[PDB]
Amino acid sequence: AMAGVYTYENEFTSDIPAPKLFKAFVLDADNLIPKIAPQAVKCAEILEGDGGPGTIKKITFGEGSHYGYVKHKIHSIDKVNHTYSYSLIEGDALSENIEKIDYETKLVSAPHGGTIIKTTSKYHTKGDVEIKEEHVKAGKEKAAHLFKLIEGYLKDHPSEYN
């Protein structure tokens, strides 16, 4: 049975400077996200580990989830370089034919003072590979919205994540 890896890059941009964002979005996601999108994210909970490399998180969704949750395994976190890698491993985007999805995200400092969020997504496939543009671009939008909500919030809370 054919094993393979579908790979998809995209970027977003943001006014928020890289480090604030990293603290908010990566480092306190568990807390900050449910606060600002309770429609779409009920809860977030660490099943195992500190929360560094090797941790397993269950994230629990509200409306607009096929399965109503995911689990993530954190592969790495680099606070100094502002990068993050993990793997979706059980739940929402997966199936018999998509064993796993890997994300790696690099925040980079744009011109001038702002940020560029670079994400690379890696679909570990089994068997024939059908991966619909929809399911993928639908995903882009979800994340794009979510980052927009973070910008907005953080701009309304400048005493935070400094």
Author numbering: -1 to 160
Task: Give sentences copied directly from the paper behind this entry.
PR-10 proteins belong to the START superfamily. These proteins adopt a helix-grip fold with an internal cavity capable of binding hydrophobic ligands. The data presented here demonstrates that Fra a proteins bind natural flavonoids, providing for the first time mechanistic insight on the function of these proteins in the control of flavonoid biosynthesis.
The refined model contains six molecules of Fra a 1E in the asymmetric unit. None of these molecules contained catechin inside the cavity. As expected, the six molecules in crystal form B show a very similar structure, which is also similar to that of crystal form A. However, a high degree of conformational variation is observed in the loop regions L3, L5, and L7. These conformations range from a “closed” conformation, represented by molecule C, in which loop L5 is folded over the central cavity of the protein and approaches the C-terminal α-helix (colored green in Fig. 3b), to an “open” conformation represented by molecule F, in which loop L5 is at a maximal distance from the C-terminal α-helix (colored orange in Fig. 3b). However, in this case, loop L3 adopts an open conformation, and the bend in helix α3 is not present.
